[PDB]
Design a binder for this molecule. Structure first.
Ligand SMILES: CC(=O)N[C@@H]1[C@@H](O[C@@H]2O[C@@H](C)[C@@H](O)[C@@H](O)[C@@H]2O)[C@H](O[C@@H]2O[C@H](CO)[C@H](O)[C@H](O)[C@H]2O[C@@H]2O[C@@H](C)[C@@H](O)[C@@H](O)[C@@H]2O)[C@@H](CO)O[C@@H]1O
Ligand SMILES: CC(=O)N[C@@H]1[C@@H](O[C@@H]2O[C@@H](C)[C@@H](O)[C@@H](O)[C@@H]2O)[C@H](O[C@@H]2O[C@H](CO)[C@H](O)[C@H](O)[C@H]2O[C@@H]2O[C@@H](C)[C@@H](O)[C@@H](O)[C@@H]2O)[C@@H](CO)O[C@@H]1O
Lengths: 302, 302
């Protein structure tokens, strides 16, 4: 029996950045390819892209502080491990290491170290996921920091915080996939792009406004499934009885349905709507499974 | 029926700090009162203390940047809201706001703002959860920052990163509860201290090594239940058929089991062990629910 966990929008976690979901949101996505690599799981529990189940790991990095890069002030070279400590293995059937950012921008966070012994230090750091030498697929990532207080050959962790806007082309683009293998290699093993195929339908996104560390940005980060759904599908591994799980968003306060959504087998939701806008609903509302239908099922407008 | 999710230790999230669990750990906890307020839930789904379900929210704060504290350089007064945006209500049946830190120390992180408009800024911040002024229960919390780039009367978020060790009395003590009401107040609505009551048993902890930002610290943070168990019990609300759920740590690699543990109804686990030490197990190992036993069920040592 297929189920969805009972969660208010305000209890959901974004699957593309480690923060709560702020609102549901829908868009025409005009002139945009929606192909996020985090928050990708089929409803029968297969993880795609760089998707992992830990809800606090996405956009984090871990590894050895190999050296300060020659000829650049306080730019530091990491030799990544996987976030669980296992070594990076570029033969993996993934675009890059699990949890790797799936967007281009100036990722702002903090680089911390423990070592030698139990000595520690941390400072503000920035990773440009759009730069030529950003190549997490093979464990090669650099971070800039304003501090020189870092030890070489000590275990180092990058904790993501938000985006840093300089006001340029290096500006946060949530839909532009990074080149996981650096400027000299092409991406492989990507989770496929998704789009609404039925007329009058749009994708339903779970949107957070991630912190901004500089410049003007609303920090919009849209995921196709909250992390809790990813986790649940992975746990249940229930077999999809059809291409579409029909869901009802219900308001427990009144006992009635607010709208319907098509949860597609491959792990995204559509609703009947038009335009770019938030979907603001009674705080207590939640999705529940109604029935298995086909991809041609017709939804009533949200 | 009662279940627990299938999770490797490395897939678990600490329920007292938003980072993955690093290892299982057990201790005599000699002359220590084990009374964490985060990651507290009964196995039938009742959340206790300051425990919330979101796995990315613990140790975060949200609030208005009221002003800079007079006569003190770059110390800033927050007027907290709840993490959900609602006003702080000191009459809540909680020791303090959900997700509030449950230890005393120099909590290191980043304070960010968005406003006016979509202008943003973020800088390192430290909050001393042990200072007299720390009074989250009534929404009064201060943070120190090395930057003066903060706007008064703009929405402010504190994202936790780790602990800052000055090497003095304000040093991290994971088992010392803060005075949630501030220096002139006694705590209330506390989740109870826990201990092994059966001879030969000790509590099984889920330990993380949280980042240190300065000084010497192992950053040891022990929780009674991974956040995933908290979330599961909350979702399931299954009736506890006895006082103790018997769990077995199984190794899927071999099909053989390694040890058993008693999951007590009030939300902590014990094992038959003696001494302070990590419990290292094959990395693919996980807990499985076996039976409903009582508090006198006798376990083979680990
Ligand atoms: C970290 C840092 O110092 N960054 C600055 C940046 O200021 C930051 O962001 C602005 C918007 C504000 O929130 C500051 O508190 C914050 O530190 C600078 O941006 C300009 O900041 C000044 C600050 O007085 C004005 O607010 C100005 O309007 C900002 O310019 C805008 O944002 C820039 C990033 C550009 O996009 C520009 O076209 C915008 O008008 C910038 C430039 O001075 O420098 C660092 O990035
Ligand atoms: C952030 C910061 O600058 N804090 C310093 C702190 O240095 C930090 O901690 C040490 C252990 C090391 O990891 C540094 O890289 C890190 O920035 C200072 O601590 C001293 O630092 C020097 C190195 O610059 C030595 O390592 C020295 O042993 C450190 O003192 C020890 O740690 C202190 C926290 C005290 O407990 C002291 O008794 C220890 O001997 C301190 C003191 O200089 O000042 C800032 O806080």
């Amino acid at each position: 029996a297929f189920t969805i966990p009972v969660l208010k929008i305000s209890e959901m976690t974004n699957s593309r950045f480690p923060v709560p979901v702020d609102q549901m949101y829908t868009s025409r996505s005009e002139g945009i390819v929606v192909q996020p690599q985090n928050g990708r799981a089929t409803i029968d529990g297969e993880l795609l892209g760089t998707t992992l189940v830990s809800p606090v790991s996405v956009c984090n990095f871990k590894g050895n502080l190999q050296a300060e890069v020659p000829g650049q002030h306080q730019l530091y070279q990491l030799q990544l491990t996987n976030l669980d400590g296992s070594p990076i293995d570029p033969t993996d059937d993934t675009p890059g290491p699990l949890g790797c950012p799936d967007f281009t921008g100036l990722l702002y966070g903090v680089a911390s170290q423990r070592g030698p012994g139990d000595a520690t230090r941390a400072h503000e750091a920035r990773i440009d996921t759009g730069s030529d030498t950003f190549a997490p697929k093979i464990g090669q990532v650099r971070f800039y920091s304003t501090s020189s207080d870092f030890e070489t050959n000590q275990p180092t962790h990058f904790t993501p915080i938000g985006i840093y806007i300089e006001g340029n082309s290096s500006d946060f683009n949530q839909w532009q996939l990074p080149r996981y293998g650096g400027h000299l290699a092409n991406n492989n093993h990507l989770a496929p792009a998704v789009s609404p195929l039925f007329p009058g339908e749009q994708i339903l996104f779970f949107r957070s406004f991630i912190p901004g560390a500089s410049g003007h940005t609303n920090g919009e980060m849209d995921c196709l499934l909250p992390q809790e759904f990813v986790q649940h599908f992975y746990q249940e591994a229930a077999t999809a009885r059809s291409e579409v799980a029909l869901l009802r968003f219900v308001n427990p306060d009144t006992g009635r349905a607010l709208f319907e959504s098509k949860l597609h087998k491959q792990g995204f939701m559509t609703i009947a709507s038009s335009g770019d806008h938030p979907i603001i609903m009674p705080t207590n509302g939640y999705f529940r499974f109604e029935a298995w239908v086909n991809q041609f099922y017709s939804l009533a407008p949200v």
